[PDB]
């Protein structure tokens, strides 16, 4: 089908034609759900519309939620202390300013050798067994360690922390024990950082004074951030890493460029981020009428920003937008959104892609994946594999 529909595990394999049908024939697409026409919403598939909408937080608010489901915030219980990705400026501004102190070049640099060691270990394990599931053995567990790092979790607690993480990530595709452990654990770690600060985002929040004094809205705000980190920082990286496998497999010319010139790997990472776009879409809510071409979207409606389509928009990337070109150097990709909410983890995600790719090519250059045997996670916003069978 080319008909608009929110993705399911069955449709994640190949949503691209439907994006194209939208972009060509109905770029400001009105969804009127037959069973609930009142919950109509709009859909944006073109690069230019998505780029400007992502930037224009005044018109396209994050404050009501990020899906197409009206009533989201209230329904899940997030009004009083929403995550930063559901705050607009000016409120979003000060918090973002404080937490950003934990997202610097030094934080991505200090974890990189840890990332490489783990990749090496799991790739050698796969190699030795002649293959296995590269998601289960590597692409799933890997991102948790990086999130743990950015949260200042002591390494000795990472295995416990990853267990909680995996339960939460699957549920958010449900996780009561894992939620409770994390909230118990971080409440304790937050208290600890009052007297033993580190360079991480939590330490920075606490050092800058958030949560002081059994109070606590501040504390819930740091806990909400921990959940933002866990729910946004894992499945996305796994979609990047796992989604890259079929793309590289089918293009031995493109692997050649990188095998002959590994310094093209940074650039190769951007192209992979472009085509995988693990956050394929997120919504905004119009705060006033807004006209894009011939469609006026009414104030108060949800708008789905198809980052995944914008990244494949032929108007921005040319008629071959659909194909891997590791030398593209794409401009203005939408993988990490654009504007106030631009992914704080962008450098961390890029690093994990760079290390994994470098070591895949160094250690498992003759590898096979069967696209038809990839199993995609459910859920309509992030596109990531649950399993990628891998033979070496």
Ligand X SMILES: Nc1ccc(Sc2ccc(N3C(=O)c4ccc(N)cc4C3=O)cc2)cc1
DSSP string of 247-261?
HHHT-HHHHHHHHH-
Omega cis (within 30) before 90: yes
Q: Please check if 88 is assigned to a binding site.
A: yes
* Contact string (CB under 6 A) for ligand X, positions 90-129, x = contact: ----------------------------------------
Q: How far is the CB of 183 from ligand X (least distance, A)?
A: 9
Q: How far is the CB of 336 from ligand X (least distance, A)?
A: 8
Q: Rule CB under 6 A: is residue 227 a binding residue for ligand X? A: yes
In the bound state with ligand HEM, the residue whose beta carbon lies nearer, of 236 and 392, is 236
Q: Pick from 132, 141, 211, 233: which binds ligand X (CB under 6 A)?
A: 233
Crossing angle for the helix pair 158-171 and 176-195, to the nearest 10 degrees: 140
Q: Please check if 57 is assigned to a binding site.
A: no
Q: Under rule CB under 6 A, which residues in 270-299 are in contact with ligand X?
A: 279, 282
Q: Under rule CB under 6 A, which residues in 322-351 are in contact with ligand X?
A: 343, 345
Stretch that binds ligand X, among 96-104, 118-126, 232-240, 323-331 (CB under 6 A): 232-240
Stretch that binds ligand X, among 30-38, 52-60, 127-135, 224-232 (CB under 6 A): 224-232
Residue 362: CA atoms inside 13 Å, Cβ hemisphere, count? Answer: 13
Burial class (CB in 10 A: 0-12, 13-18, 19+), 210: buried
In the bound state with ligand HEM, the residue whose beta carbon lies nearer, of 132 and 232, is 232
Stretch that binds ligand X, among 187-195, 231-239, 266-274, 322-330 (CB under 6 A): 231-239
Rounded CA separation 317/331 (Å): 8
DSSP state of 382: B
Rounded CA separation 174/178 (Å): 9
Name the strand (E) or helix (H) holding 267: helix 265-276
Stretch that binds ligand X, among 1-9, 196-204, 206-214, 221-229 (CB under 6 A): 221-229
Q: Pick from 236, 254, 280, 358: which binds ligand X (CB under 6 A)?
A: 236
Q: How far is the CB of 210 from ligand HEM (least distance, A)?
A: 15
Give me 178's structure tokens.
Answer: 């894992």
Q: Over the range 178-195, which residues count as b (16 or more CB within 10 Å of their CB) and which as e? A: bbebbbebbbebbebbee
CA angle at residue 211 from 210 to 214, to 5 degrees? 160
Q: How far is the CB of 381 from ligand X (least distance, A)?
A: 8
Name the strand (E) or helix (H) holding 303: strand 302-305
Q: Rule CB under 6 A: is residue 83 a binding residue for ligand X? A: yes
Stretch that binds ligand X, among 14-22, 51-59, 227-235, 368-376 (CB under 6 A): 227-235
Q: Please check if 307 is assigned to a binding site.
A: yes
> Are the beta carbons of 18 and 3 closer than 8 angstroms?
yes
DSSP state of 342: -
Task: Give which of ligand HEM, ligand X, none residue 335 binds (C-beta under 5 to 8 Å, depending on kind).
Answer: ligand HEM
Catalog residues that contact ligand X under the rule CB under 6 A.
66, 83, 85, 224, 227-228, 231-233, 236, 279, 282, 343, 345
């Amino acid at each position: 089908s080319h008909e608009f529909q929110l993705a399911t595990a069955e449709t994640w394999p190949n949503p691209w034609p439907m994006y194209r049908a939208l972009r060509d024939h109905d770029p400001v697409h009105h969804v009127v759900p037959p069973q609930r026409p009142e919950y109509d919403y709009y859909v944006l598939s073109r690069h230019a519309d998505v780029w400007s909408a992502a930037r224009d937080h005044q018109t396209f608010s994050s404050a009501q939620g990020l899906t197409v489901n009206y009533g989201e915030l209230e329904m899940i219980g997030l009004h009083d202390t929403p995550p930063m990705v559901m705050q607009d400026p000016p409120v979003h501004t000060e918090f973002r300013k404080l937490v950003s102190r934990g997202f610097t070049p030094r934080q991505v640099e200090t974890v990189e050798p840890t990332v490489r060691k783990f990749v090496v270990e799991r790739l050698e394990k796969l190699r030795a067994n002649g293959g296995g599931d590269i998601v289960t053995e590597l692409f799933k567990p890997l991102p948790s360690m990086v999130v743990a790092h950015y949260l200042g979790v002591p390494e000795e607690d990472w295995t416990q922390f990853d267990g909680w993480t995996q339960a939460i990530v699957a549920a958010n595709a449900g996780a009561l024990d894992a939620v409770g452990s994390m909230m118990a654990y971080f409440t304790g770690l937050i208290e600890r950082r009052r007297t033993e600060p580190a360079d991480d985002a939590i330490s920075h929040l606490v050092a800058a004074g958030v949560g002081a004094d059994g109070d606590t809205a501040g504390t819930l705000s740091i806990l909400a951030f921990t959940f933002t980190m866990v729910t946004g920082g894992n499945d996305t990286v796994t979609g990047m890493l796992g989604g890259s496998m079929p793309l590289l497999h089918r293009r031995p010319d493109q692997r050649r460029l990188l095998l002959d010139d590994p310094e093209g790997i940074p650039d190769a990472v951007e192209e992979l981020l472009r085509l995988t776009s693990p956050v394929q879409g997120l919504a905004r809510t119009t705060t006033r009428d807004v006209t894009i071409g011939d469609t006026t979207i009414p104030a108060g409606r949800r708008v789905l920003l198809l980052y995944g389509s914008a990244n494949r928009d032929e108007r921005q990337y040319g008629p071959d937008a659909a194909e891997l070109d590791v030398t593209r150097c794409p401009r203005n990709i939408l993988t990490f959104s654009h504007g106030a909410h631009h992914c704080l983890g962008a450098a961390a995600a890029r690093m994990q892609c760079r290390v994994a790719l470098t070591e895949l090519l160094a250690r498992c250059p003759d590898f096979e994946v069967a696209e038809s045997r990839i199993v995609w996670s459910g859920g309509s916003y992030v596109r990531r594999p649950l399993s990628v069978p891998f033979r070496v």
